């Protein structure tokens, strides 16, 4: 009984005990810990165990994608080290999540086929640029006390697959053409099992995986760390589903969760992560999730002309917008960046402050 509770407290949330021990151990095993934490940080989670769960999901989805993600995040961490960035930040996985996203989405969008080893070569360079660009953004955004927010990934993944494009002999990408025909959406044709399955599929799309089992694995990883993040994740994916229904989105897109990943990320960040969890904050999170869906439709349409995907551009632009709003209410409380942690610590910090 007490043992199970102690174990639950230990694998929950940022592993403070595990993090304090790691400093002592060997450098390579530390690097592995930082890579795992960064792999979990896409979901705003600082849990190495959730990182192993995430990598299990990625291995389940596609082994080439998992390899690209691993090499991307490890080289992002190494580049953060060689540039002498803050090791508190590297050890918290704040520089590796951009790398894993870069690797995963270059694997996803590459038309060269599975096990195209040359794709590692840009995967390294874009990952090495994940720290640089991150710092370049942090400086601009630290003025308003806003986080970096996956913006580096976006710039890099787009910068790659607009520089190469579909008609590139070395690194071809998938053809993304803008919609030039009216779509006959039939409500009778809609399938509800797939619609309600879009929640895990959206949680999976956060990493680029379209498999529902991978999304369930991701939710398990979230619930190991923070139940608030899990709740806001499901709510964000549901908001994306409903919004896609409301904007006459093609059904196959809602089924594949392409309307959910931006919304889930927005709901995590604007819920517990940067704003103190209050009912006002939770409704702000749902509103930010709805806005984010519009951004996904918009940024998807505006970037389909360039042959580019809309990838996390929507979240950043929504979460940044909702983190910049100034109100006269003391219930929509914006946390300082250093103090920010998983939503439970944020809630405890908020409550102590008020007392």
């Amino acid at each position: 009984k007490a043992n199970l509770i102690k174990w639950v407290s230990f694998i929950s949330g940022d592993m403070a005990a595990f993090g304090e021990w790691m400093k002592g151990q060997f450098i390579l095993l530390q690097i592995m810990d930082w890579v795992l934490r960064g792999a979990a940080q896409v979901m705003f989670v600082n849990n190495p165990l959730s990182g192993l769960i995430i990598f299990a999901g990625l291995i389940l989805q596609n082994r080439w994608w998992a390899l690209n993600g691993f090499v991307g995040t490890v080289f992002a961490t190494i580049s953060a080290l060689i540039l002498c960035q803050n090791r508190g930040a590297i050890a918290a996985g704040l520089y590796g999540y951009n790398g894993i996203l870069v690797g995963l989405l270059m694997a996803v969008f590459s038309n060269a086929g599975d096990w195209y080893w040359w794709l590692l070569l840009p995967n390294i360079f874009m990952s090495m640029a994940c720290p640089i660009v991150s710092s370049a953004l942090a400086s601009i955004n630290s003025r308003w006390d806003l986080p970096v927010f996956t913006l580096p990934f976006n710039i890099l993944v787009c910068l790659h697959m607009v520089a190469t494009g579909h008609y590139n002999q070395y690194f071809p990408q998938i053809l993304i053409q803008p919609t030039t025909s009216m779509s006959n959406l039939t409500w009778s044709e809609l399938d509800y099992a797939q619609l309600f399955r879009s929640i895990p599929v959206g949680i999976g799309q956060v990493y680029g995986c379209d498999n529902a089992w991978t999304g369930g694995i991701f939710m398990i990883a979230l619930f190991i760390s923070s139940p608030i993040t899990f709740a806001h994740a499901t709510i964000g994916s549901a908001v994306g589903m409903v919004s896609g229904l409301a904007l006459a989105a093609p059904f196959k897109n809602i089924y594949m969760g392409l309307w959910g990943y931006n919304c889930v990320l927005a709901c995590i960040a604007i819920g517990g992560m940067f704003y103190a969890l209050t009912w006002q904050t939770h409704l702000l999170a749902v509103a930010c999730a709805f806005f984010c869906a519009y951004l996904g439709s918009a940024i998807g349409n505006v970037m389909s002309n360039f042959g580019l995907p809309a990838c996390t551009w929507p979240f950043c632009l929504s979460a940044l917008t909702f983190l910049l709003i100034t109100t006269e209410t003391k219930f929509i409380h914006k946390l300082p960046l250093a103090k920010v942690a998983y939503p439970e610590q944020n809630l405890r910090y908020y409550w102590k402050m008020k007392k």
Copy 2:
């Protein structure tokens, strides 16, 4: 004699006496006053009477457009209230003009036809987002002491009609395709009555109305409040006309005032409104109006690829550029934002300061 003068002083400029009385009256009538002030604030005018004049013009142009504008501005005001934004700002109509523009231009660009009630549903949401985005912009721009400048509207109206597009089953928009053929502009074909009628048509296009009578109504509303704003309005529309002639613009576009609304807004703001009215400031306003026309040609061409209109993107980007320039002359005086009012108060404040 003295009575007419007193009445003129009272309906002129920000109605200080009317504003001080309103605080006392009932909440709903206050909301109506704030809605009317916001409707007049597109023209940078804080006059409720000019707001009634503007709504008369909108009713004259299209009753569906007027209804969408009214619902948009009322919901922008309500959203500003529920988010606990400054009531000095809401009472000055600084949160409702974006809403009325959103409603009007969604009505204008919707291909679903007149009296498409479902268009109210996005008209509400984009209007509710007018405060949020406004604050999101204000924070960034308050650092340089600049105004939001209708940027929220732009983001929202574009975000809508790039998310939906022409090929959307629920909210179709008009097809805006980029120019793919050379145009044979004939100077002999030019009609001068329509060219010189483009001044009121441009003042109308500020709100989306292409009717010359509506533009005359708008000028009457301006002259009730501030003659300087009226003069700069006519000058801006004329600058847009001349520039459109100078850039080989199609004649039908100049006739319909599509070259004037950005220029008139730029000339109002860079003339009396944010810069103290000096001959140097007035020439800066004319130069900003000319720049703005180039932006309209440019932003129109760059956004026609996305199927989007260029709507007020040009003004903001010009007025912001001309408000950021630093000179060593004390005659190009940039006013602080709180002190800014209608150009007559700005001139009086400037002159007192110098004395």
Copy 3:
């Protein structure tokens, strides 16, 4: 012997002795000096003699292009004077390089043919807007202590040739269509003389000249002022060549140096000019040059949809990114803007500081 050394010291680097004398002489000859310094400032060089060398190269390439460049830079200087901008900045050519680039590239991209005198009319206006926009950018960027970096030129040249476009009756521009066919790049077809000749051709493309002799003239102008700038120039052009090979770029583009001008500018700025010259800084400069090539491929592809060129947008966005990165190493030292001069003075200032 001592005489040759004294002369070398005098035509080297910012001509401090010549600059101090000029203040005394007549206003028109001063204006000529400032125009020449601005013509040399595209290469980050404050040497009037290098300005004469640059204008000799431009006259060699195309006399229409040279005339447009001269009129653009002279009107940029005049506009900087009439707006009462800092004469320390005007006398250093910090306001004329944007003008010469605007004139040169409007001449380059105009489809109206050689000696189209009407092209002078926009060449004047865009040049007159070079100071305004410059100040508009400086204010934003002085907060982070970064330079304007030729961003004004970019905005203006693009703003022109997106406002006019290929199908414009008065100011037609060249057709730039996005790639819609796969290219069969053959390594056997590659010619090495042209590949290695791409270094001077890239240095020429910095000003828009595709002639190798003009590039050699430009390198001579650089070596008169600062050998470090010459070394970083050749290294940047070589990096652009190698990157273009690495991204499957068409061979004719690498031969014409279209992959080098952004890289050479990035390597100059991130090498000696704004960062103190250290081996860490030099590797940062090479990395910034490689990033810049990706930007050129990307910004070229993203802007080819609009019918626009990618012109120096890549450099600014790379140099700005690499100037915003914050590290914990004291060897990547960012110089303050006022202190910045040619790389030799930067190195001497750095070394004195450390002592």
